[PDB]
Amino acid sequence: TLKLCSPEEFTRLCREKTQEIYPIKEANGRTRKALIICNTEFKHLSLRYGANFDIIGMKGLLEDLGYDVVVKEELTAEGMESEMKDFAALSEHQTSDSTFLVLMSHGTLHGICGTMHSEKTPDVLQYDTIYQIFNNCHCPGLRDKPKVIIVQAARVEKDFIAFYSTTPHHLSYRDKTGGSYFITRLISCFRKHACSCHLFDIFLKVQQSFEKASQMPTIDRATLTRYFYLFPGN
């Protein structure tokens, strides 16, 4: 389980390192929202078996971090774009301090695949469109707030960071019982280090664990201007 951060450390860091961390809102009156989009069944592509474990894993972790998790499954690229636009306009963001975006499906070189995707009939959502939907102009509720994008895609912008894994689907699961190596190790490191490490160190420790145990997940499009401490339990 996720080990929590005491209120003494929370206030001590917030009063002693105020200029260097993103401002966190207290749990009382806070409405953190996160969005998980996952595609398992495809008309032309193979089924992403085991993705259900990833969904339950991430949503559980995000709830322990204080996020009300919207879950959307089996969408086309046009459906993904519309669901992202709907999620970006949520008024709850104006009383939140951050958001998480989890994207799990098959992937192309510069985009993530929808349910209808084929090389003859493309159904792809470009990653550029994701950043435009959530930027400062088009998403006023999340201005100057960290926007974390977790992508598992089997193959003005500011305050963004993406963690990116494209391992082939049939090679990303240890058993038929767990989730993926990427999601499992991400959850494990978050449960262990979120109470004492900011977001970038957590991603680095996930990458360190991949060296000890295959291509490694990448940190991408990082435009964070502060350290992002989650302060779990506050």
3-state secondary structure the chain: CCCCCCHHHHHHHHHHCCCCECCCCCCCCCCEEEEEEECCCCCCCCCCCCHHHHHHHHHHHHHHCCEEEEEEECCCHHHHHHHHHHHHCCHHHHHCCCEEEEEEEEECCCEEECCCCCCCCCCEEEHHHHHHHCCCCCCHHHCCCCEEEEEEEECCCCCEEEEEECCCHHHCECCCCCCEHHHHHHHHHHHHHCCCCCHHHHHHHHHHHHHHCCCCCEEECCCCCCECCCCCCC
23 falls within a domain: no
40 falls within a domain: yes
Residue type for 73, please?
E
Quote the CA–CA distance of 210 and 130 in Å, as a whole number.
Answer: 27
2 falls within a domain: no
233 falls within a domain: no
- Rg of the chain taking only CA atoms, in angstroms: 17
What six digits make up the tokens of 104?
């799990």
- Provide the domain count of the chain: 1
74: CATH: 3.40.50.1460
Among 32, 146, 159, 143, which residue's Cα sits nearest to residue 96?
32
37 falls within a domain: yes
163 falls within a domain: yes
CB 70 within 8 A of CB 36: yes
- The residue segments making up the domain with residue 117 are 30-220
161 falls within a domain: yes
Quote the CA–CA distance of 226 and 224 in Å, as a whole number.
Answer: 6
Q: Which residues contact 144 (CB under 8 A, 6 or more apart)?
A: 136, 158, 159
8 falls within a domain: no
